Amino acid sequence: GTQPIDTVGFETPMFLAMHGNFPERIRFYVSTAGMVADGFAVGSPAYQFATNAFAGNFAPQRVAIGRMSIDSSKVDFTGTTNTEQVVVNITLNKVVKAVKINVNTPAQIATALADAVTADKATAVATGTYVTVTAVSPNVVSVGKGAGVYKIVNESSETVATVLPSVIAENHNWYFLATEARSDADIVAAAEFAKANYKLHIYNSTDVDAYAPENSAASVFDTLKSLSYDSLGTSDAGADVDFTEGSVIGAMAANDPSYGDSLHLKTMPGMVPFAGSDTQRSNAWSRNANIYRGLYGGGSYIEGKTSSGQYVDVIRFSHWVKFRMEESVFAYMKRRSDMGLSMKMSDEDLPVLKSVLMNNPINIGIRNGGILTGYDNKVSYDPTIIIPKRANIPTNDLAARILRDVKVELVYNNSLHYVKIRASVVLDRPSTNAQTP
Amino acid sequence: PLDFTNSDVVMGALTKAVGRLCLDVTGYDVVEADETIPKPEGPYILVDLSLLTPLDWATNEVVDEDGVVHTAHNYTASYTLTAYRGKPHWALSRVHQAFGLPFLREKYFPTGSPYAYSSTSNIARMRVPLNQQMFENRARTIVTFNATFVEKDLGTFEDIEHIIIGIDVDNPSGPPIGIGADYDKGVKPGGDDPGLPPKPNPPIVYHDAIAQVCM
Amino acid sequence: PLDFTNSDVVMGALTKAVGRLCLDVTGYDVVEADETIPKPEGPYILVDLSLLTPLDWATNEVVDEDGVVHTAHNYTASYTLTAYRGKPHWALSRVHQAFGLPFLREKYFPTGSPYAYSSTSNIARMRVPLNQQMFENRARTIVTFNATFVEKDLGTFEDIEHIIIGIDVDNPSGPPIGIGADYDKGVKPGGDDPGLPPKPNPPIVYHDAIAQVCM
Amino acid sequence: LTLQAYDPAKVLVFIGGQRVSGFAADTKIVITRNNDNISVHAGVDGEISNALSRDNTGVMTLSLQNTAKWNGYLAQWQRQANVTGLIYLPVQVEGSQGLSLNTIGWIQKQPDLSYGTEVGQMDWEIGVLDAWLSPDQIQGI
Amino acid sequence: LTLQAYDPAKVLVFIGGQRVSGFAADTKIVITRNNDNISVHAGVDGEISNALSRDNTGVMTLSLQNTAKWNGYLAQWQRQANVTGLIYLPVQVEGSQGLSLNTIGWIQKQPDLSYGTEVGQMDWEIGVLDAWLSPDQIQGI
Amino acid sequence: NQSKILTLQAYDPAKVLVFIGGQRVSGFAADTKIVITRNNDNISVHAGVDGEISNALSRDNTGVMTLSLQNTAKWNGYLAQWQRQANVTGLIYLPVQVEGSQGLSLNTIGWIQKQPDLSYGTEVGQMDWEIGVLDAWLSPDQIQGIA
């Protein structure tokens, strides 16, 4: 029973964070200041994602944040090295704090972090490589990144495959999908929900099996490849601490698919250039794990391919056409019914759908260049609309008051990615038919 | 509940409108061709609806509340008048001029009525022998009127409650992508989302400076 | 196996289409001129196919599977309607307006049907003496319809299985060179020669450089 | 297989989304183009070269009885556009058996209104921004 | 609900405040504009751009029997203005069912007067300083 | 073709505003309202015998602006007074501005360079005032999307 989104929703991205800062299941913001007011700690996951999303060239106007019941955080130094003042930002019930640990080994740093016991409500529990922070029933705690080399991890009693059906029921006016959980089960559940609700799933992973040799691997990229979904995946080193899905979305949220524009070379502020070697790049390209290569002193995305090998822009264009046609038909049918002139099921009224559909969804694409037109061979690329006649409508469909088998056809006008040249240098230059072929 | 006046009502009332104006102007007595009676005594006029012409294509369509359709057509009805004694040619002429008098018309041809006057033909005076002894004075003319007739349909078609559309986007990177679109009567595309916040109207406050610049 | 509906079917079905629409609108009873019966009781309408006009040159040709040809011609059939009692002029008018009502037409004149309505003539009201006692009310009109008639040929010509052509090239170096050319139904000019090799599509491979130049 | 007969009642005109009604007798509409398809340049010795026409506007006339309710709509649309500057509306035509058309267009000139003893006529001039006829409705093309 | 029938007798013309009377048979008036609504500039490659018309004058013809008393009034008004320089008078038209009009205007040219064996006709040309028709009197617009 | 409509809103000539000295001009002629021209081309080319090419940048950017007004217009009075004002007092300059409804704008100072030819006949005449503009760089500011 998927209800349709509208134009504003087509740009709104949703991030499924863990927190308890508001009672609702979802809220919309137009800047990080609102989230700060709601008690999100600077450097917290949702804050980072919102900053990245607003920091893009094609940034969206509003960002939606979901809620998943939080249980307890973690400040993990395991496997890290630190020779700098470690700092952690903590917000407690609208009270904002800062924590400082000087300089030494990660275990010593973690133990010394237990000093976060003053002016508190909340509790801190060191464990030799990480500190587990747990709040108390009435207290609310937000823990955010600072200057230290550490990653913040959250845990919850819920699961995505059960939280999402609540968020969508609460509100459905959003298109992109993202999550904080990074387990394979959570990622696959998100992909399966998104593919069923016609939403684009995005995710960043740091697993080295993306680099692993093509001969064999068992990474989430490979699982999605096998299942043949459309989730857009990318491999980044800093994903687990920066949630760069926001940066990815910020480079594609605002440009409409009517231009047929792709994602091949767009700069994404906040991302960190890929570091592996050319063999690793070749390996990754096989799994459809897009990378952010740094070239000629700048950063550039690479080829934006989805899990099943298809390009992202074709999928997005098809979805845009779907939503635009839905909206246009609803608008026209509602205007017709505002007057006492409702559209009847007769041959004197049915054809008008041709112009109604030509106007809003299709003609804009033909104008802007996303739809190919012209002549091929013995075929033409012009979009076509076919509508049935009253004689062909089944009597059961007449009784149910439903119209079926309205068909449309188009051609997509893809963009260019690669170029090859055959230059030649010579010290000099060397049949004369001169007859028209 | 959205009722009207069909053709039968307009057509029958047009005769009586002509009948009253002839009686009220000429002072003669009036009779129709519909049923025959022994010839009255004294001068009198005979009214007949000789001819009726349609105009091909309907000019207006009115949709009932439930969807039934009422169609309106323009017509032109011609009446043949005959005056049988006295000064018949004088009698008919005064009928002609009556349509130029404003107050007299308003009684029988009020603004908004479904029929109107158009024109008149030549008035011919005639002498007819009777019993081979006497010549009787008579006259004849044809008066053309405008009209508009409305009729009601015999049903309606079903409404469009649900629309299903199939879409195929041919592309070179792979096989065509099939995707569908749908519409439902009460399902808004955006649900009831409040949308973006509006730009607020600032409250009304006092200002000391006509034009102030602040860095 | 490629069948159709010849003229006889269309012509006979057009009368019944007019008959049902007159019955279903005016409420009168209907009768044709084809066979005579004692005059019915109550108001009724008489239908007659007075005239039929052809259009000279065929508009379409449909070739059977085996080569037989079916030719289509445009026509125009005129029907004379007469209403005999009651308010005949009112009855005929409602028939005229019926062709403007959408739902009512769809019952008898569905889209794609081989006949259609064109126009209508003036409706004349008449009074006819009977037995020298009474005047009977009547009316008359002519309704013009469009139509299309299809007929099937009585055979076909033979196909061209073999063609022989003689050629003579006059030149100055000697006598003209005689040479022939031939065609046969299944003999391709080149037999089944594969032709030149095609330009292969390179396989899809990974590229490190966006734009690479190699000497 | 029954071939169609030309049905004058199924010739439809949709302007802006609604259907026009209330035509005058005889010709309901007329469609005419403005320019020739190809321009031929002929040389002194007989060389011939052709140029393709890149201006494809047309004109469509629309005969309406002066009592039609659709006169008011066109009069309102005409005056509205003269102020706002938005002049285009979708235009679509159908044929019972004939050549259709589906483009955008605008009201070009105001017809001539005359009053007399009988219901008259007004002939609107609707410009159409492309004038290519289509074989959609031909039965067999 | 009874729909109107076109009443030729309720077509009114008010010039200067009074009502005109004494028309000749057939067409009482005719209203015609002078210029096209929009001017279209078409480029070599097919780019199209439009311009809005800012000259909206029209012309209205007025058929009067040569014995009408209203011929004298127009003749007097015409000569008066040629001397004083005041040429404008209000002009208003109504339709029984049709498009009205309400602007100012002036007498443009003197008609042609001819004398014969029967009462003739004179066709005055009244310029109107704006020619936008109005749906005021349409029953349902 | 409808995919190449160069103007989605009809070009209304009445949107073109002209302000001289801070008052809006009105009372224009029949066909053309204004014309803006330069006097000197942008750069000078000095080409040598053997093909050496070098270019120079101009430093005279003055232009001329023509303003067509019906000779019955009231604004003829304001300009006529201004001429005598400047001839005696020696203050010639005056701000000038133009609004490019769907084109190029202009905003500079200018002065009356010459007075037109006044003619009287059977039709209402016309006047072409020349408002020399000190600097004549056209501005694209009215156009959106200029990156």
| Residue F61 C-beta-side C-alpha neighbours within 13 Å | 9
Give the minimum alpha-carbon distance from C128 to chain A in angstroms, rounded to a whole number. 44
**D31 alpha carbon, distance to own chain's centre:** 5
Residue D85's closest CA among E54, F103, E41?
E54
d(CA D11, CA A63): 51
Residue E16's closest CA among E122, E99, E111, E126?
E126
Is the CB of residue F7 less than 8 Å away from at least one CB of chain A? no
| Residue B169 C-beta-side C-alpha neighbours within 13 Å | 24
Query: CA-nearest residue of chain C to A302?
Result: C210
Among the partner residues E30, E134, E140, nearest to D75 by beta-carbon distance: E134
**E22 alpha carbon, distance to own chain's centre:** 16
- Residue carrying the six token digits 């502020």: A269
Asked whether the beta carbons of D12 and D19 are under 8 A apart, the reply is: yes
Q: How many CB atoms lie within 10 A of CB B74?
A: 23
Is the CB of residue D117 less than 8 Å away from at least one CB of chain B? yes
Asked whether the beta carbons of A236 and A206 are under 8 A apart, the reply is: yes
Report helix, strand or coil for E7: coil
Q: What is the DSSP string of A394-411?
A: -HHHHHHTEEEEEEEEEE
Residue A197's closest CA among A345, A322, A336?
A322
Asked whether the beta carbons of A109 and A84 are under 8 A apart, the reply is: no
Is the CB of residue D129 less than 8 Å away from at least one CB of chain F? yes
Q: Which residues contact D3 (CB under 8 A, 6 or more apart)?
A: C4, C60, C72, C114, C148, C150, D139
Q: Do E2 and B147 touch (CB under 8 A)?
A: no
Give the minimum alpha-carbon distance from F111 to chain E in angstroms, rounded to a whole number. 30
The chains in contact with chain F, meaning 3 or more Cβ pairs closer than 8 Å, are: A, D, E
Give the minimum alpha-carbon distance from E43 to chain B in angstroms, rounded to a whole number. 33
> Among F1, F3, F5, F15, which would you mutate to test the D interface (most chain D Cβ atoms within 10 Å of its Cβ)?
F1
Give the minimum alpha-carbon distance from C203 to chain A in angstroms, rounded to a whole number. 14
Query: CA-nearest residue of chain E to B60?
Result: E3
Phi-psi region of F40 (alpha: psi -120 to 50; beta: other; left: phi over 0): beta
Is the CB of residue B81 less than 8 Å away from at least one CB of chain E? no
Query: CA-nearest residue of chain D to E57?
Result: D110
Report helix, strand or coil for F4: helix
Pairing mode, if any, of strands A26-29 and A63-68?
A: antiparallel
Among the partner residues F5, F12, F14, nearest to E48 by beta-carbon distance: F5
Give the minimum alpha-carbon distance from A184 to chain B in angstroms, rounded to a whole number. 28
Query: Cα dihedral angle (A363, A364, A368, A373), rounded to 10 degrees?
Result: -20
d(CA A38, CA F68): 63
Q: What is the DSSP string of F27-71?
A: -B-SS--EEEEESS-SEEEEE-TTS-EEEEE-----EEEEEEE-T
Burial letters A219-239, b for 16+ CB under 10 A, else e: bbbbebbeeebbbbbbbbbeb
The chains in contact with chain A, meaning 3 or more Cβ pairs closer than 8 Å, are: B, C, D, F
Helix pair A278-287, A220-227: axis angle to 10 deg = 40
Give the minimum alpha-carbon distance from C211 to chain A in angstroms, rounded to a whole number. 5
Among the partner residues A278, A286, A391, nearest to C208 by beta-carbon distance: A278
Q: Say how many Å lie between the first and final Cα of chain F, rounded.
A: 27
Among the partner residues B8, B53, B56, nearest to C90 by beta-carbon distance: B8
Experimental method for this entry?
A: cryo-EM
| Chain D residues with beta carbon closer than 8 angstroms to that of E8 | 115-117
Give the minimum alpha-carbon distance from C207 to chain A in angstroms, rounded to a whole number. 8
> Among D67, D103, D128, which would you mutate to test the E interface (most chain E Cβ atoms within 10 Å of its Cβ)?
D67
Residue D79 backbone phi and psi in degrees, to 5: -70, -35
Q: Do D104 and F2 touch (CB under 8 A)?
A: yes
Give the minimum alpha-carbon distance from B44 to chain C in angstroms, rounded to a whole number. 20
Q: Do C94 and B58 touch (CB under 8 A)?
A: no
Among the partner residues F7, F13, F14, nearest to E49 by beta-carbon distance: F7
Is the CB of residue F117 less than 8 Å away from at least one CB of chain D? no
Report helix, strand or coil for C45: strand
Asked whether the beta carbons of A238 and A272 are under 8 A apart, the reply is: yes
Is the CB of residue A348 less than 8 Å away from at least one CB of chain D? yes
Interface present between E and C (3 or more CB pairs within 8 Å): no
Cα separation values, A293 from A242, A278, E34, Å: 18, 11, 67
Asked whether the beta carbons of C122 and C89 are under 8 A apart, the reply is: no
**Six-digit token pair at D32?**
């005419």
Query: Cα dihedral angle (C160, C164, C168, C174), rounded to 10 degrees?
Result: 170
Give the minimum alpha-carbon distance from D85 to chain F in angstroms, rounded to a whole number. 5
Rg of chain C, C-alpha, whole Å? 34
Q: Do F6 and E43 touch (CB under 8 A)?
A: yes
d(CA F30, CA E138): 37
Residue F11 backbone phi and psi in degrees, to 5: -75, 110
CA angle C153, C155, C159 (to 5 degrees): 125
d(CA D33, CA D130): 9
- Contacts of the segment C131-140: beta carbons below 8 A, 24+ positions apart: C134/B36, C135/B33, C135/B36, C136/C84, C136/C85, C137/B34, C137/C85, C137/C86, C137/C87, C137/C88, C137/C89, C138/C82, C138/C83, C138/C84, C138/C88, C139/C82, C139/C83, C139/C88, C139/C89, C139/C91, C139/C92, C140/C80, C140/C81, C140/C82
Query: CA-nearest residue of chain C to D22?
Result: C100
Query: CA-nearest residue of chain D to C71?
Result: D3
Give the minimum alpha-carbon distance from D54 to chain F in angstroms, rounded to a whole number. 8
d(CA C121, CA F82): 77
Burial letters E48-65, b for 16+ CB under 10 A, else e: bbbebbeebebbbbbbbe
> Is residue B8 packed enough to be buried (19+ CB in 10 Å), middle (13-18) or exposed (0-12)?
middle
Is the CB of residue C3 less than 8 Å away from at least one CB of chain D? yes
d(CA C24, CA C98): 10
| Chain A residues with beta carbon closer than 8 angstroms to that of F3 | 363, 366-367
Q: Which residues contact C182 (CB under 8 A, 6 or more apart)?
A: C162, C163, C164, C165
Asked whether the beta carbons of A19 and A40 are under 8 A apart, the reply is: yes
**Six-digit token pair at F41?**
């081309």
**Six-digit token pair at C82?**
């007469």
Among the partner residues B11, B149, B155, nearest to C97 by beta-carbon distance: B149
Pairing mode, if any, of strands B162-170 and A402-411?
A: parallel
Interface present between C and A (3 or more CB pairs within 8 Å): yes
What is chain A's length? 437
- Chain D contacts in chain E segment 61-80 (CB below 8 A): none
What are the DSSP E strand ranges found in D5-109?
13-15, 18-19, 29-33, 38-42, 48-52, 58-64, 89-93, 101-109
| Chain D residues with beta carbon closer than 8 angstroms to that of F10 | 81, 85-87
**B157 alpha carbon, distance to own chain's centre:** 25
- Chain D contacts in chain A segment 355-384 (CB below 8 A): 355-356, 358-359
What is chain D's length? 141
Residue F106's closest CA among F142, F79, F71, F74?
F142
Q: How many CB atoms lie within 10 A of CB B186?
A: 6
Phi-psi region of E46 (alpha: psi -120 to 50; beta: other; left: phi over 0): left
d(CA B3, CA D133): 43
Q: How many CB atoms lie within 10 A of CB B120?
A: 16
Q: Do C100 and B73 touch (CB under 8 A)?
A: yes
Residue E95's closest CA among E9, E11, E4?
E11
Q: What is the DSSP string of F75-88?
A: HHHHHHHHHHHHHH
d(CA F21, CA F78): 11
- Chain E contacts in chain B segment 45-74 (CB below 8 A): 60, 62, 72, 74
Please give the helix or strand (H or E) that residue A244 lies within, else none.
Answer: none
Helix pair B7-26, B88-98: axis angle to 10 deg = 120
Q: Do D102 and A347 touch (CB under 8 A)?
A: no
- Residue carrying the six token digits 């990480």: A130
Residue A417 backbone phi and psi in degrees, to 5: -120, -45
Q: What is the DSSP string of E10-35?
A: G--EEEBTEE---BPSS--EEEEESS
**Six-digit token pair at D130?**
């492309």
Q: How many CB atoms lie within 10 A of CB F111?
A: 17
Among the partner residues E46, E47, E50, nearest to F10 by beta-carbon distance: E50
Among the partner residues F1, F11, F12, nearest to E49 by beta-carbon distance: F11
Q: How many CB atoms lie within 10 A of CB C179?
A: 10
Q: Do F12 and D85 touch (CB under 8 A)?
A: yes
What are the DSSP E strand ranges found in C55-133?
60-63, 69-83, 115-120, 123-130
Q: Say how many Å lie between the first and final Cα of chain E, rounded.
A: 15
d(CA F127, CA F116): 6
Cα separation values, B142 from A401, B122, D122, Å: 54, 8, 29
Asked whether the beta carbons of A45 and A180 are under 8 A apart, the reply is: yes
